[PDB]
Design a protein around this ligand. Structure first.
Ligand code: ATP
Ligand code: ATP
Ligand code: MG
Ligand code: MG
Lengths: 292, 49, 146, 49, 49, 49
């Protein structure tokens, strides 16, 4: 505390929040678990070893000799279900899930703002163990304009404050930094630099086995009359994302309403894929007159 | 006080020592003491005042 | 898609699927995409939020961000409600890489839009209805159904 | 001082040249100095006449 | 530090401001040493020359 | 320590009414007069004063 007309220290003020930090946690655990996410199947184990495991026991990671992650990227297509993996982590880590947008650390004037990047990590340290997810780094991992001058200094400073802090509050799990990105080939290395992060988990639109489980979990809640096979559908919708599979499930059931029915059937699904998949990467229709 | 000049400030956080950190819309945050002309229950981060 | 779960959520509930989260409109301009949007507004009567994607983004960074938080935050309290944002290419359009002054601000705005829709957040019953002038001028993220 | 080959080059250029100039500048300032310059097969290449 | 009723300098403040790394990664005195790399013994001896 | 403060500005334009508009680095723009040792022949628009 300083005085207005004299500016002398009279008291200490204990900070833990400001309005922005208050909206970043806690939601008292989401509705998504690994129960509610289908297979990927190997990349489920990896994301677990990267976060959850050193969290309960940085003593066992140090003891062995191995460095835990310094930050976690999830990188892959949209809608493969990534921010979706982040809610799951939240339910079972039981460790306060900070949801913040990387857009909010870059603000109109200066140390609204830059102060905020150091504020999220101060919070992190007292709330520990934690679990900060920031989220699609495209405005905290942006390349430098040189310069836009109002814009550019903010994005440049705030980029550096992220990387330098994680490096330094983590030799060993204490605060784990977790995150995700859609694209990273649009921007220069900062989080793609191996002297800062070092664990990038490839999370790709799903394997054959993965597709079936997602159809299974969506259909679990759906009312059905059995002649359905999820595996055949899975083949057709090869090369599609986890959200395309959801979009088909939601249309098959709407389709059922049009039929005057509330039970879904294999016929209902196959139509549902045709609509979607056709507005999407394509369906074959000719193999030449010189091949079968 | 109920008359203007009046200034909207929006509560930053609330302290239990008997003070409130208000982020003013002017710029600066400041610590001001509580009164029996408010409730701090009604005050929250993002409470206009 | 819209009038039906808004006005009778029970029937989607009975099957076990979710209500629709939206509609994307594309194709040739002048076929009446925004006209259609004014058509459903007269019959929903359930609070029609009108913004335009070029009224998002302002002169300093993070004021735009602020605006995108501000429509969704309001929409969760009135829900059900229709947020019809006229262009989604005006807040998120395909790039090779950014070149950077004006170009970067576009992905900044994009991050904010994702997040709220059902990115992580509860959507309530919004129902963000989009439009784009040209078929392919969006990013895969928007293109992707869900 | 490490400049990677990933920063280097853009679809049309000028900023790419500034950062060669940047590491040269730091090296003078902060001598003795070793400038690591990877990955020279994406920023140096065959001449066309 | 300026005596702010004339805005004239009254005191140079030690530290003189913390510099901001550019041209990243810069590692002033790297921790990786030649003992911390093996198996490329002969490459060490060449790069030293 | 008591050394007087002079605001810095750059000439915006030179007016023909024997005054000069100099836009400060504070922000505002001012119509300023001139001293009898300083003249408009020695100023040009974008002259620091
Ligand atoms: N494997 C899965 N299990 C259950 N639901 C899934 C699965 N994958 C995707 N979904 C569904 O996909 C939608 C969620 O997409 P989400 O917004 O979480 O994407 P993201 O990959 O983090 O994307 P962005 O790149 O746009 O930030 C929901 O409808 C969710 O149910
Ligand atoms: N079905 C229709 N019957 C009559 N007039 C119509 C019809 N469809 C569109 N129009 C008219 O065409 C004009 C342009 O259509 P509108 O402004 O709704 O288009 P849009 O496809 O969203 O365009 P933009 O790319 O410019 O955003 C308007 O005058 C509109 O009334
Ligand atoms: Mg995401
Ligand atoms: Mg239109």
């Amino acid at each position: 505390a300083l005085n207005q007309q004299t500016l002398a220290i009279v008291n200490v003020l204990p900070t833990s929040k400001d309005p922005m930090v208050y909206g970043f946690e806690v939601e008292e655990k989401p509705e998504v678990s690994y129960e509610d996410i289908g297979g990927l199947d190997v990349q489920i184990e990896e994301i677990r070893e990267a976060v959850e495991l050193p969290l309960l026991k940085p003593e066992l990671f140090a003891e062995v000799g191995i460095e835990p992650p310094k930050g976690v990227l999830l990188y892959g297509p949209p809608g493969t279900g990534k921010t979706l993996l982040a809610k799951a982590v939240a339910n079972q880590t039981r460790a306060t899930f900070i949801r913040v947008v990387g857009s909010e650390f870059v603000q109109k004037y200066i140390g609204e703002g830059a102060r905020l990047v150091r504020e999220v990590f101060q919070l992190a340290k007292e709330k520990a163990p934690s679990i900060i997810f920031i989220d699609e780094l495209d405005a905290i991992a942006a390349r430098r304009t040189n310069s836009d001058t109002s814009g550019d200094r903010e994005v440049q400073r705030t980029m550096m404050q992220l990387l330098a802090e994680l490096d330094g509050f983590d030799p060993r799990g204490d605060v784990k930094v977790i995150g995700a990105t859609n694209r990273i080939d649009i921007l220069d290395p900062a989080i793609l630099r191996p002297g800062r992060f070092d664990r990038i988990i490839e999370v790709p639109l799903p394997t054959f086995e993965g597709r079936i489980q997602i159809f299974k979990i969506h259909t679990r809640k759906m009312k059905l009359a059995e002649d359905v096979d999820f595996k055949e559908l899975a083949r057709i919708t090869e090369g599609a994302s986890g959200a395309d599979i959801k979009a088909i499930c939601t249309e098959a059931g709407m389709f059922a309403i049009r039929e005057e029915r509330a039970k879904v059937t294999m016929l209902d699904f196959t139509k549902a894929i045709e609509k979607v998949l056709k507005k999407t990467t394509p369906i074959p229709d000719l193999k030449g007159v010189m091949f079968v | 006080l109920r008359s203007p000049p009046l200034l909207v400030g929006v509560v930053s956080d609330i302290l239990e020592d008997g003070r409130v950190v208000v982020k003013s819309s002017t710029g600066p945050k400041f610590v001001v003491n509580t009164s029996q002309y408010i409730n701090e229950e009604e005050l929250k981060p993002g409470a206009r005042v």
